[PDB]
Design a protein around this ligand. Structure first.
Ligand SMILES: NCCCCCCCCN
Length: 60
């Protein structure tokens, strides 16, 4: 593609609340794998994959 694969930048830190969730720090860059319509997106960051709330991030 002309652009990289989709990413977003965390606006706020998120601490996973379940085993299927992803934790990250504010300003972390997350690779987006899936964008569920609920806003629970699937991301990868530093050797972790998991669900995270999209209201904590901004697409870049
Ligand atoms: N712990 C996250 C639960 C929220 C539900 C995520 C939706 C996944 C749908 N495959």
């Amino acid at each position: 593609g002309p652009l990289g694969s989709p990413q977003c930048k965390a606006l706020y830190a998120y601490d996973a609340q379940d085993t299927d969730e992803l934790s990250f720090n504010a300003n972390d860059i997350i690779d987006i794998i899936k964008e569920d319509p609920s806003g629970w997106w699937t991301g990868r960051l530093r050797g972790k994959q998991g669900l995270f709330p999209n209201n904590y991030v901004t697409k870049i």
